[PDB]
Structure formats: C-alpha cells, structure tokens
Design a protein around this nucleic acid. Structure first.
Ligand SMILES: [Zn+2]
Ligand SMILES: [Zn+2]
Ligand SMILES: [Zn+2]
Lengths: 198, 281, 64, 159, 151, 199, 198
RNA sequence: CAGAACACCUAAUUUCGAAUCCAGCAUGAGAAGC
C-alpha cells in the first residue's frame, strides 16, 4: 500500500483573523481584546484547515454539477457516496485524507498584533463603535500536511483545486472585509505505509 | 475522645503534685482533680470546687461541674484558657445559665459508623442555623449517608429497568416456521459449526430460548439474524473462511432457516440434535 | 507574642514551631425502622439539619 | 384488609400464571399498595409542609403508527427516545419541559432541536412532521410508565 | 377480587405519617397475590426443570500409568463405576475423557507426572482400558483392587 | 523469562488532543456543559487508550510490508495467534507479551483540558448552522506510559518505536482527520530483571 | 505456631480496574445492560481475587532467580509441596500458611463502578466496527485485604512485598494488556500472639 | 514595610452551543490428594 503526503505551506497576504475557540483562552483575553486569535498553548496560531477545504470542494463540485452532498445545512448528514465523502468522511467510513491544522512556524509575538477597529456613523462621519481584535500579520508562514490513506488518482488535483479556492476566497473569519487572503505552496510525495518498519 | 456515662477517656484507656507516668497523669488538690496529658489532649477532670485551689501549670480541655461564681473564678486564673469546657454533673437549666457566662468569656462549651451528608440553601430562623430537608438514611456497611429523592429516583429507575428486562411475555409457556428434513439439519449444523457461525454459546442460547417456548426461540433467532438498517450488521459470529460477501449472506440465511426449521421439532428431538454439538445443554 | 500570651491564648512562632477537631456529623433521629429495596438499608426521614459551630446535627421535627 | 391501588393492565402470562413486574410501597394505612406517584405527591406535600414551618390525547394505534413513521425518517432517533424515557421516568413536568425544549424554534436562528427528516419533503411538511412529533411525544406523557416503556422498547430496545 | 400479601411486613420504615416500605413486586393473578422475587426465581427454576424433564500387558500399563498419575484414584473409581454400571457407560466414559477438545486441545486425562509422548501415553490409556472394557468383571475387580484400595 | 522489557514512553502534544469520554455517568454529567468531554480519570487526569492504537499502527504497517498479520479490526474478527502482533499485543489463546498502560497525563485537566467551540459553516450563506462545544487537551501537555514486554525478543523494541512513529503520523485518538491528536514520543527503554523485586 | 503475621494491605487504583464478574446469575442479569460487569459483592462492593495474583507473582519471580519453585499455572498441574510458594500458599497435602483475603473495597458501586463504551475500530476504514459496554472500577478507589500468615518465617514479609511490587508493575484483575488494573499498595505489618482473643 | 517610566475620545455588543450510529461475539466447565 501507499499513502500520500501533501506538505502545505501558507503565506499570509492580507491580515488573517481566525477566532479563539477555547473558553478559558477567550474570556481571559476579553479585558484586552474583543476578538482573540486562535492560539496554541505553545503560543503559535492555529487555523482549522479541513472545513475550509471541504466547504471549498462542496461549493466547486456542486457548481460543476456532480452528486456531492452538502455538509453545511442544519444537521446535514453525509451520504457516503461522493468524492467529498470519500476524502473527508461520512457517517460510515472515516475520511481518507487526514488534514492537519495550520500551525504557524513563528510564535504569537512575531505574528500577532493587537489592532483597533471601528464603526463609523454614516451621517455624522464620526466614530460610533470601537473594538480591539487580534490579527495575524502578512507574510506569516503556516505549515500543514495532508495525508491520504487510500490514495486515488484525482486526489492531489482535487486538494489543489480547493487550495486555489481558498487562495481566492480566503480562510478564517472576517472574510468579506478583506481579512484572510493567503497564498499556498504545495510539495507532494507518495510514501509507503511500511516506512517506519525497519 | 471522652465518652460520657462517670467519665471514660479513650486514647491506654483510662477512665476518670508528683507525676506518675503511665499518658502523664498528675493529681492536683481541689480544696481531688486530675490532669491527664496525651499527644491528642491535656484534659482536666476537676471534680467539685470548695476557694484558693491548685490549678495546673495548658489545660486544653476542662471538664468541670457546678450547680456559680467559683466555677468562673476557676475558669479564669488558668494559663492558656481551654479550647472547650464541658459542663457535667448538674441540673440542666443551671448548666445553661452558667454556660451563657462561659460563652460571654468567649470559651466554647458542650452540654451532654461515620455519618456523611451528600446534601446541598440555608435559613437563619431562631438562634440556630438551618436548612429544611426531607431525605433518606442509607446504612452502608461502614458509613451512614444522607440522600434526597433524586438518589431514590435513580435507584428506583435502575430497579424498574432491571425488573422489566427480566420477564418476557410468553416464556416457558404453551405454526408457520420453515420446514426441512433432519438430514439437511445435520449437514447444515455440522457445516455451520466447523466455521464459527453456530458456536457453542449460540447453540446453548438457542437451547434456553427454545426451552422458554417456540416464540421465545423465534424472537431470539430473529434478533440474532436481524440486519441493522445503519451498520448492515447481523448478530452472528463471522464465518472463519474465505467466503466473500454473498455466500456470507446465504450462509447466515442458512443458519436462520436451519434453526427456524429445527424449532418445530420435538424438544427431545432437538435435544438429541444439539448435544452432538454442545455437550452441556 | 508576650501580650497575647498575657491574654492567655497560645502562640506558635515560625522558627519555634496537637488537638484534633473533628467537625462531627451526628444523627439524632430514630434508626431502627429501616427497610430494603435495592440491597440498601434505607429509611425516609424528614427533618432539619442544624449546622451548629463544631457540629452538624440532623434533628427531627420534634427538635424544631 | 389490603387494597391494591394499581390498574392491572400490562399483565404478561408466565406459563399458566398471569404475571406483572412491578415496584411499589407497602403502606400500613387498609394495608394499601401504592405506586411511586403516591411517594412523589407525599414527598412534595412534606416539602411544602416543612418549608411552610420555616396534554392532547391520541389513540394508541395512532401513537404506534406515528412513532413508526417518525422513526423511519429519523426525526425520532433512539437517542431521542432514550432521553425521552429518562425525562418521562424522572416525571411529567420534566418530559413536558424537554419536549418543549427540543421543539422550541429558536427566535434568532429559526432552528428546531429535532433531527432532520431523511428524504425530500417540503419545508412546510418538514415543519408539520416536527409538530406531529411534538403532538405524539407530548401525548405519550399522558399515559402511565408501563405503556410508555412497552411502546418505546419496540423502537429503542434498551429504552 | 381478593388480595393477599406474601412479603414480610416486619422490617418496614415509618415516614410522613405513613408506615411505608419500598418493595419489589410480582403481582400474580389467580385471588390477586403480590409476591417477591424469591417466588419468581422459584417458579422460573421449576418451570425450567419441568421443561428439562424430557492380561499381563494391562497390568503393566496400569502399573505404569498409576505412577505418572495419568490414571488416578478418582479415574479408577469412576472407570470401575462405569464398568459396574455396564459396558456402554464404559465406552461412553473413556470416549468422553479421551475427547480432545477441538478448540483448546487439552484432553481430560490427568497430565503425566513431548507432545508425541503425551499423545502416545493417552493412547496407551485408551487401548489399556478399552482392552479392559471387554474382559470379565472379576478380572477388572482384582486388577483395580491392587491400585485403588477402596475400589 | 529471566528478563523483561520496560519502555517508558513520554508523549508531548503538538496539535489539540481529543479522546472521548467513555464512562456513561461522567459523560452525561458533562453533557450538561460540553458536548464532547475528554476521557478523564476520577483523579482528574487525562486517560487515553494506547494498546489499540499501537496494535492498529503495527497491523497497518506490517500488512503493507507483506507480513502474515491477521486483521483484528474487522467486526468480531478472531486473531489467529501466529502473527507478530499476536505475539506482542495478544491472541485468543495467549495474552500479549506487551502490557501497554494508558497514557496518563502528568497534569490535571484544569491545566490541560479546555472547553472549545466548533461549528458547521453553511456553505452558501457562510453562516453557522450547528455550534458544538467539545473539550480538548492543550499542546505541550505531557503524557506518560510504560510498555512492559514479558518475554522480549529483539524486534519488540523497534516494532513499538515504528508504531509510535505511525502515531506521530496519524494521531493517537479522537478527531484525527481534523488535525487533532498530533503528538511526539520519546522512548527510554531498559531490560529489567524479572526477579528485581525479590530482595 | 505462637505468632501470626498480619499484613493489612490498602491498595489504591492508579488506573481503571477491571476484574470480571464471576457469579452466573449476576452476570446474566447484567449481561443485558452492560457486557463486561465487574465483580461485585451482594453488599455491592468490588471483589478482586488476591491470592492467585500473589502466587503467580512469586512463581514468576522465583523461577527468574532459578530457585526450585514449581508452577501451578499449566493445566491440571501439581504443587510439589516443597517450594516457598508451596509453603506459603499451600499444596495438596498441606494448606497455605498465608491466608489471603479478598480485596474488599470501602466504597460501593455508585461511587466507584462506572459503565463504559469500549470499541473495535476497522484498520482501513477507521470506523467503529464493534461496540461493547463494560464496567470498570475508577482510579483513586481504595481496597483493603488482610493477609494472615500462621507459622511465620523470616522471609514472608519480603516475599509478600516483592509480590506486591510485581502486581503494581503488571496489574491486577483483567484487561491487563490494555492498561487496566495498575494500582499501588501500602502495607501495615504487625506481629500477633495467636491467643489475643482470650 | 515594597515594585517603579502636540495631545485628546473610544475599545463595546449579539446569535448559537446541538444532532446521529453502534453497544456485539468467542473459548474453556476439569483435576488431584486426604
Ligand atoms: Zn457524500
Ligand atoms: Zn493474529
Ligand atoms: Zn511446589
């Protein structure tokens, strides 16, 4: 057998905001910032990659028109019989592609900055609301891999198509405000499952 | 720990100015009192009072008696004032009237299986602090614990589940099942016994659910053979062998048909069938 | 330390540094009338817990 | 004398002997035989005394048919039937509150906490299936514990 | 319409002005009797049972197997009990204890005090006592008297 | 026989780590607060199963190499008793020589387990359909285990180390596909005497 | 003859603890709600068989030293009646000096016994092929057992403590390979004149 | 009786936090001494 390594590299091109999900990390940062960035306990920034890739592939493949279910409606059960269900999982089989998180190569101090945002009154043209958030600066580099357990033929091109959708549309939050525009560099390799067996 | 009756003291298990060393015991004169020392305590059994007595050198516990001013004079002039005094050997109202005055000198009194509160509210009504509560007293073998109706609810529901899943509708009580000759029953149960779909546990469970009537056996064989809508998995043991996927299904169908056909055979006949396979029962 | 020894309460300095105080819980209700339901020796009782200094007691309606 | 205070429906037949699995309270009152309801009412009556001192109806066959249909579209899963057994067993006000909780359309999201139906149905009818599920599972609370268990162990055995 | 209780009315609690006891029931219909679980375990057992109603070479070999404990005093007593019962029970008995389980592989003989030698000695026990299953009962009695004193 | 292998395994956490709560009562106690509780002890420590992950790792890699290893992951599949993983982790006849403990954490929940929020983005309107809270283990959390092989041959070190490297690849437990469970291992191996404790 | 060694053993579980349910009716009553029930008393306390654990521990460690200790492990084996485990734990002609009590917990089932969900995962599909429920005793649960040794020698203490460190290393009960049953022992030893009841 | 380093104004707020599958198999029921 074989398994496919997809070493994925993200360079941030416009300030990246993904949100902190840990409750203890978030209600203890609320005295400082109203929008914390998702961080590790090693203080490196974490981005959820899988759902972005799977959302990308549902949107593009549904536009091309094949039988691909949606895993985005309210309690949407996967079918099991599609390319997205084979790659990323269903209620029967698991996902053949294990998509690791996007951890930054630098810690928070180099790449996270604490910015001030505002809501301007449209009539008086004055500052109406003010809130502080955290953003990942541009040029920060995030590394992931994607491992495909049972590799089929179309799978690299499919993942790279989703990685072109994420380059154009974005990853993370505040996506329509310009936050989260990224560039991907991908190095791929096919490896045998018996590699650690000396 | 003093147990009142006289005065018993459990450390050595003694029960009530030179020093006799048994638990350092030393008798001072009352004008007689005894001062006992142990690692957990410096107790003083005073006896009665008469005016200038001989108070010991720290009297951690002071077990005195009175039936009024002299009791309090003796409650003072004792270095390192006691932790808890004990008011014994008198009328209850006079003990309380003295005790109000030992509280006024800020010294605690007590007038004469482990039990655990598993409770949770409070009220400040009258002189004492409280919380009204209706509950249960369990008497476990080394504890006595207190619970409320939520715990009785949980064991009542456990008893209801354990007693509902214990008696079926028409078991051991008194048609349209398949039919097949005894020779094919021999060949099928031999074949399904070498490979492990019909195994000794399954033959034994068929034997109990056949002894509990035909309908209990029909129910058991159906719920063993019932393929799940979701997993697509039947409760048979998988056959040991190459069998790819469809003769798997035909083989489970063979087990279904053979057991269901064996159901209408006589009880002694299915016994002479099964003991060649499972010697026990 | 000398003045608080004069008030006749005890001092432990840190460089110069044994009663047990069990905050006891005790039951003041009848115990004899108990049954078994789920192999538990239980008894329904209704009353009043009274948290008195140095002693939590469980007292009946008679006490209240 | 002794008085049983229980309706003797749900009586099985063990061999030649009719039989009921049951839990209760011997009361030396008329030596009455009283159910758990008795205990809950008398517990709450003593709670109020202590502290003082200081549903629509549906037919049974329609309940089986509707719970059958809602089981096939997986609105009523066995997780729902198991938790409904827990909240009915705890009491009836708890089962009312649980069923109102799962049926409450949240005003901010518009979402019911049921499981969505399997298959193509119009959104009006999917909502009507939800309202049907509210009506049957609420109507189930009007029955005793015995028929509720006997109804829902055909769908979730272990419930 | 009558009701009769069959559970102890002695070890019962008192609470809230009612002498109450939580108890588990098995309401029977005939009068209407209320039984505990001991009666139900009884009836379950009794309905179950009701349904459950329906020559020098042998001396040398037995002298060998007495010392390595393959045949033993209990084995002599039960083999002689099968012989005293008859001949069919003897063949059934030695077939049952020689029966190597196809799942585990362990015979019901007592172990000797390789696997090829183990199989050869168990086969020696089979041919020894199966030869002894055909001789006269007096000879079986005098041979079995020498090794088991009681039988 | 006379010797026995002790493999002290120290695991550090890199990505968030989830392993679901298996005890019913502990889980239902936590489902009033969190929808995916971390598998936790009663001494407030994080418990991760470790034998089955090692067996699954060695099964997949030995099967890919070409060795005659049975698949015990299939539903009610009987281990034959002649594979390498049958000698290590166990068969039906004999138990495993390797007795793997759980990965007991070196800290205690309130320092390593955090309550997190995950969603389900509706793909066309980019809003949140479902929102669920799950507990996870922080990164840099230290877990300890010991693998005690009773009768060591020479391969039982390297096979365990290879399976550990596979657990660095796929993850130890829980949501391995979303990126959870990525861990690293350090190995301190020693061959102790069996008669060590006899004075 | 005039003295007995008393070994008050208090054992506290550092791991989940599974021993199997032994009684047929208790098992078959709890083979419905759970599939691997733990050993209970009828006073609802957890039983662990302790003598066989100590006897097995001593036999492996004493065969490791090369002492002429027998093995009552193989099928239908023989106590030789001459070893130190034969003197301690008994032979067929002589009883055991060390009478080893069952490991009686101080808590009941609702405090320490928890049901569970154990799984079997398919290696290729990464999905739960099998599910089964099994009771376990919690970590931090503590148990007591009194080992009483009549006719004591010098070395019964050392052998019993050595067996207890071996039980700590291996585990006690069942599922010992999965990490179950790893515990810690505390021992209070006391010499006793046998006539202290008079 | 311990920390201490050109200008303002702001730095809040609101939703969700659920839903589902599975909980099965299999082996062993004997010895021996007194
Ligand atoms: Zn799909
Ligand atoms: Zn194998
Ligand atoms: Zn020996």
């Amino acid at each position: 057998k074989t398994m496919k390594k997809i070493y994925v590299t993200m360079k941030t091109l416009s300030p990246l905001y993904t949100g902190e999900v840990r409750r203890e990390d978030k209600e203890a940062a609320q005295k400082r910032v109203n929008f914390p960035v998702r961080k590790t306990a090693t203080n490196k920034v974490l981005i959820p990659f899988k759902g972005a890739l799977r959302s990308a592939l549902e949107i593009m493949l549904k536009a091309k028109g094949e039988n691909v279910c949606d895993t985005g409606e309210s309690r949407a059960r996967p079918c099991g019989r599609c390319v997205t269900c084979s790659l990323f999982g269903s209620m029967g089989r698991a996902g053949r592609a294990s998509v690791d998180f996007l951890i930054s190569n630098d810690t928070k101090e180099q790449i996270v900055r604490e910015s001030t945002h505002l809501r301007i009154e449209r009539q008086t043209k004055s500052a109406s609301d003010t809130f502080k958030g955290e953003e990942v600066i541009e040029g920060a580099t995030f590394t992931a891999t994607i491992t495909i357990s049972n590799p089929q033929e179309k799978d690299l091109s499919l993942i790279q198509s989703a990685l072109k959708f994420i380059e154009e549309n974005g990853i993370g939050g505040w996506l329509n405000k310009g936050y989260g525009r990224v560039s991907f560099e991908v190095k791929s390799e096919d490896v045998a499952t018996d590699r650690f067996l000396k | 720990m003093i147990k009142f009756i006289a005065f018993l003291l459990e450390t050595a298990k003694i029960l009530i100015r030179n020093t006799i060393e048994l638990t350092k015991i030393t008798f001072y004169n009352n004008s007689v009192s005894v001062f006992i020392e142990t690692h957990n305590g410096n107790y003083l059994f005073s006896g009665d009072i008469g005016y200038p007595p001989d108070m010991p050198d720290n009297v951690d516990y002071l077990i005195l008696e009175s039936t009024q001013d002299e009791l309090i004079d003796y409650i003072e002039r004792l270095k390192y004032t006691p932790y808890k005094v004990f008011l014994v050997h008198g009328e209850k109202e006079q003990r309380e009237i003295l005790a109000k005055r030992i509280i006024s000198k800020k010294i605690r009194v007590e007038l004469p299986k482990v039990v655990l509160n598993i409770n949770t509210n409070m009220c400040n009504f009258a002189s004492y602090r409280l919380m009204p509560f209706s509950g249960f007293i369990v008497e476990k073998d080394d504890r006595i614990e207190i619970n409320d109706k939520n715990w009785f609810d949980m064991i009542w529901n456990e008893e209801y589940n354990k007693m509902r899943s214990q008696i079926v509708a028409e078991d051991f009580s008194t048609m349209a099942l398949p039919d097949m000759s005894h020779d094919k029953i021999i060949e099928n149960i031999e074949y399904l016994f070498n490979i492990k779909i019909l195994s000794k546990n399954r033959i034994k469970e068929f034997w109990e659910e056949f002894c509990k009537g035909q309908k209990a056996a029909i129910k058991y064989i159906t719920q063993v053979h019932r393929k799940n809508p979701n997993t697509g998995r039947r409760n048979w043991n998988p056959p040991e062998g190459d069998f790819t996927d469809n003769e798997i299904e035909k083989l489970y169908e063979t087990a279904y048909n053979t057991l269901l056909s064996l159901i209408k055979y006589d009880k002694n006949k299915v016994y002479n069938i099964l003991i060649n396979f499972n010697p026990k029962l | 330390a000398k003045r608080i020894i004069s008030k006749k309460i005890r001092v432990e300095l840190p460089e110069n540094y044994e009663i047990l105080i069990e905050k006891k819980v005790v039951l003041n209700i009848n115990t004899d009338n108990m049954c078994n339901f789920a192999s538990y020796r239980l008894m329904p009782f209704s009353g009043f817990i009274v948290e008195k200094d140095d002693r939590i007691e469980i007292n009946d309606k008679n006490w209240f």
